[PDB]
Amino acid sequence: ACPAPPPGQPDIRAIGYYTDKAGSVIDPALQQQNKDATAPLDRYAADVARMSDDYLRNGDPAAAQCTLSWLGAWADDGAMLGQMIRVNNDQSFYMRQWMLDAVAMAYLKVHDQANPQQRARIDPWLQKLARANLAYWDNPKRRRNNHYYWGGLGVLATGLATDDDALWQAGHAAFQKGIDDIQDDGSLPLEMARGQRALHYHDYALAPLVMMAELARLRGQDWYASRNHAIDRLARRVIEGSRDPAWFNQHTGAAQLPLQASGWVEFYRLRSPDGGVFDAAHARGPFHSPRLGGDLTLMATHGIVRTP
């Protein structure tokens, strides 16, 4: 049957772990403190991705029903709509954005099996989560780096799964901020500030944008073109940096930590002129990222959704 959903807590208390302004040197103790305070959150994101994956893999509505049941349970519970407790930075907000990405993607993947009683309980929950996140970004004091783009993913997914065109435009807007931040050398001036993790965060900035561009395709919309294919520039710099960190290691004062490019390559393999460049990355194996929707290999090959 459907296993019992964990109780949904209406509060996030996450902890920051970078020590320096570059957001590069992890404090392993504060990182293990966050891993323990966000393990219930991650376990649910993994569980709703896993079951949404299972429905895609074999069509079985039971996995889609158990996914919808868990989401509606956490919607009833008002999960994550509480106080985002500030320990040493905005990690609790970040965590809500990433959890929104996971649950909104997982809803999406199983949305063609939802009763009208499921949508009515799930849709206002995701729309509250999304508008709560957008409100953080209404403040011009908040620098719109990769966090803005990751927030865009879940906002956009909610707008698409709830048929909310103001949330769709909001997502599209963050995507456009991404593509417009991409310089002619393929870099991103704010992620170039991450020192050791400049490459890492370039990759981190790409995955949501690519993923946003795929949700666009679900409405029959090609956003990969924008700004003289600026996403091709950013993708180029990431994949040619996962093998050759020399450019980042030079352009940043710091030496890079090796990168295995994220599962966005699963999708961009099918969209670039020479998808062959992504053969090594592809071979590193089936990519799973709940925050990015789950089984990216599955969704790249057979589609984020079974039916439109």
UniProtKB/Swiss-Prot annotation:
pH dependence text: Optimum pH for enzymatic activity is substrate-dependent, with optimal hyaluronate degradation at pH 5, poly-beta-D-glucuronate degradation at pH 7, and alginate degradation at pH 9.
Catalytic activity: Eliminative cleavage of alginate to give oligosaccharides with 4-deoxy-alpha-L-erythro-hex-4-enuronosyl groups at their non-reducing ends and beta-D-mannuronate at their reducing end; [hyaluronan](n) = n 3-(4-deoxy-beta-D-gluc-4-enuronosyl)-N-acetyl-D-glucosamine + H2O; Eliminative cleavage of (1->4)-beta-D-glucuronans to give oligosaccharides with 4-deoxy-beta-D-gluc-4-enuronosyl groups at their non-reducing ends. Complete degradation of glucuronans results in the formation of tetrasaccharides
SUPFAM superfamilies: Chondroitin AC/alginate lyase
Primary localization class, coarse: membrane
UniProt key word Transmembrane helix: no
Positions of N-palmitoyl cysteine lipidation: C2
GO molecular function: glucuronan lyase activity; hyaluronate lyase activity; poly(beta-D-mannuronate) lyase activity
Effect ascribed to mutating H147A: Retains 10% of activity toward poly-GlcA, but shows less than 0.5% of wild-type activity against poly-ManA and HA
One GO term (biological process): polysaccharide catabolic process
Cellular component terms (Gene Ontology): cell outer membrane; periplasmic space
Lipidation (S-diacylglycerol cysteine): C2
Swiss-Prot/TrEMBL keywords: Carbohydrate metabolism, Cell outer membrane, Lipoprotein, Lyase, Membrane, Palmitate, Polysaccharide degradation, Signal
Location within or outside the cell: Cell outer membrane
Record-listed E.C. numbers: 4.2.2.-, 4.2.2.3, 4.2.2.1, 4.2.2.14
PROSITE patterns noted in UniProt: PROKAR_LIPOPROTEIN (PS51257)
Family membership noted in the UniProt record: Belongs to the polysaccharide lyase 5 family.
Role this protein plays: Polysaccharide lyase that catalyzes the depolymerization of several anionic polysaccharides via a beta-elimination mechanism. Exhibits broad substrate specificity, catalyzing the degradation of not only alginate and poly-beta-D-mannuronate (poly-ManA), but poly-beta-D-glucuronate (poly-GlcA or poly-GlcUA) and hyaluronate (HA) as well. The oligosaccharide products formed by enzymatic cleavage are comprised mainly of disaccharides, with a lower abundance of trimers and pentamers. Is not active on poly-D-galacturonate, heparin and heparin sulfate.
Protein name as annotated: Polysaccharide lyase
Organism: Stenotrophomonas maltophilia (strain K279a)
Organism lineage string: Bacteria, Pseudomonadati, Pseudomonadota, Gammaproteobacteria, Lysobacterales
